[PDB]
């Protein structure tokens, strides 16, 4: 009865956008798998924090399905996610089964690369807007967190707590998200 | 001419309170060493994120001195910091040379254990107040970030951005901290 989240971790990912959702989701009792895009080896993130994944993506894919698939940002991380055929397959399967897809900062540009959720309202980091809007396939939003059906997006490292709590609310409800929020000492 | 920060990483540390200051300090051009208390092996943090340190604390101690020594929180991480004689020696040396000491959440309780900065105004996580105030050796504050001379403290995972930017302002000035802040998309 426990919900399950997949976080896909590529070289160049933004380490704050990776660790904040993982930690907050585990506070909410969600079972999180941090899966390395390239294998099980440690991943060097954008500001040189090195994180050890829980599993390779090839192995984690076999233990699906997941209630949410989470794509962190970081410019080079998102470019690696965008080029990966394994990511394409996971996202197409998630969209087909009507599961949640959550992406932050540069991360949503991988939705465009893999043709996911066309017609949705999305947000990104301000510096990633032009890339996301190439072709006009989404409608752009400047909200800090945006949710349109099964696509949940957010803007940057500084929106990572709000993004993670939105995932918790979507999967476990408003009361659990409020309970998890209180000991964090967030401003608003 | 580059400033240098030491971040001491123990089993049980709060991984958000570790990664946010490391990332933000590196954005500001500070040279950061993440040093493992127990050696160079990967460290399992409080919510099971596993981080690989840059160095063991024994080796990093030899490459001092540092412009700031940073103590993350997490209850079990702070207890490990509090029991360590190597930490005691680093903090006493930093206090003697009038370098900055920065600690967040449960982290300041290691200052009490090692008799650092008695007489200062400090804050902690609300759940750590009674432990920090045993004996009356500090004056308590509920500000989100508190700075009294060379002791800089802050309250919890949700104050980690404000805490890291205060370190940047203390070492590199207000203009650099404002420049680093803008692309993060912080609310306030």
Can you give the residue ranges of every domain in chain A? 1-187
Q: How far apart are CA B122 and CA B143, in angstroms?
A: 9
Helix (H) or strand (E) holding A161: helix A160-172
A47 neighbourhood in chain B, CB within 8 Å: 22-23, 26-27
A51 — contact with chain B (CB < 8 Å)? yes
SS3 content of chain A, % helix, strand, coil (to 5): 40, 20, 35
Q: How far apart are CA A85 and CA A167, in angstroms?
A: 25
B133 — contact with chain A (CB < 8 Å)? no
Helix (H) or strand (E) holding B81: helix B75-82
Rounded to a whole number, what is the distance in Å from the CA of B103 to chain A's nearest CA?
15
Q: Provide the b/e sequence for A15-50 (b: ≥16 CB within 10 Å).
A: bbbbbbbbbbbbbbebebbbbbbeeeebbebbbebb
Q: How far apart are CA B40 and CA B95, in angstroms?
A: 26
Helix (H) or strand (E) holding B109: helix B109-113
Q: How far apart are CA B159 and CA B14, in angstroms?
A: 13
Rounded to a whole number, what is the distance in Å from the CA of B96 to chain A's nearest CA?
30
Confirm if A30 and A3 have CB atoms less than 8 A apart. Answer: yes
Q: Provide the b/e sequence for A56-71 (b: ≥16 CB within 10 Å).
A: bbeebbeebebbbbbb
For strand A100-104 and strand A151-154, is the pairing parallel, antiparallel, or unpaired?
parallel
B149 — contact with chain A (CB < 8 Å)? no
CA distances from B107 to A101, B41, B82, B170, B182 (A): 35, 22, 9, 19, 28
Contacts of A88 (CB under 8 A, 6+ apart): A113, A114
Q: Is B45 one of the catalytic residues? A: no
Quickly list DSSP for A39-51. Answer: -SS-EE-TTS-EE
Per-window interface: A 65-124 vs B, CB < 8 A:
none
Q: Do B157 and A185 touch (CB under 8 A)?
A: yes
Helix (H) or strand (E) holding B83: none
R_g of chain B, CA atoms, integer Å: 15
Contacts of A175 (CB under 8 A, 6+ apart): none
Spatial CA neighbour of A21 closest among B51, B143, B15: B15
The residues with which A148 forms a beta bridge, in sequence order, are: A151
Q: How far apart are CA B32 and CA B35, in angstroms?
A: 9
For strand B151-154 and strand B145-148, is the pairing parallel, antiparallel, or unpaired?
antiparallel
Contacts of B175 (CB under 8 A, 6+ apart): none
A127 neighbourhood in chain B, CB within 8 Å: 183
Q: Is B114 one of the catalytic residues? A: no
Q: How far apart are CA B18 and CA B22, in angstroms?
A: 6
CA distances from B158 to A181, B58, B186 (A): 9, 31, 12
| DSSP conformation class of B41 | S
Q: How far apart are CA A94 and CA A44, in angstroms?
A: 27
Question: Number of C-alpha atoms within 13 angstroms, CB side, residue B147?
Answer: 13
B157 — contact with chain A (CB < 8 Å)? yes
Q: Is A11 helix (H, G, I), strand (E, B) or coil?
A: coil
Q: Do B26 and A42 touch (CB under 8 A)?
A: no
CATH class in words for B1-187: alpha beta
Q: Between A and B, how many CB-CB pairs are < 8 A?
A: 91
Helix (H) or strand (E) holding A184: none
Give the position of tokens 């205060």: B166
């Amino acid at each position: 009865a426990s919900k399950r989240a997949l976080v896909i971790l590529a070289k160049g990912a933004e380490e704050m956008e990776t660790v904040i959702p993982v930690d907050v989701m585990r506070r909410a009792g969600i079972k999180v798998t941090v899966a390395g895009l390239a294998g099980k080896d440690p991943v060097q993130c954008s500001r040189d924090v090195v994180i050890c994944p829980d599993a390779s993506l090839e192995d984690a894919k076999k233990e699906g399905p997941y209630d949410v698939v989470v794509l962190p940002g970081g410019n080079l991380g998102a470019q690696n996610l965008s080029e990966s055929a394994a990511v394409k397959e996971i996202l197409k399967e998630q969209e087909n089964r009507k599961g949640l897809i959550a992406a932050i900062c540069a991360g949503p540009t991988a939705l465009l690369a893999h043709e996911i959720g066309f017609g949705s309202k999305v947000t990104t980091h301000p510096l990633a807007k032009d890339k996301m809007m190439n072709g006009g396939h989404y409608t752009y939003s400047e909200n800090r967190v945006e949710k349109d059906g099964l696509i949940l997006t957010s803007r940057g490292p500084g929106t990572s707590f709000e993004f993670a709590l939105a995932i918790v609310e979507a999967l476990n409800g408003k009361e659990v998200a409020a309970q998890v929020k209180a000991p964090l000492v967030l401003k608003d």
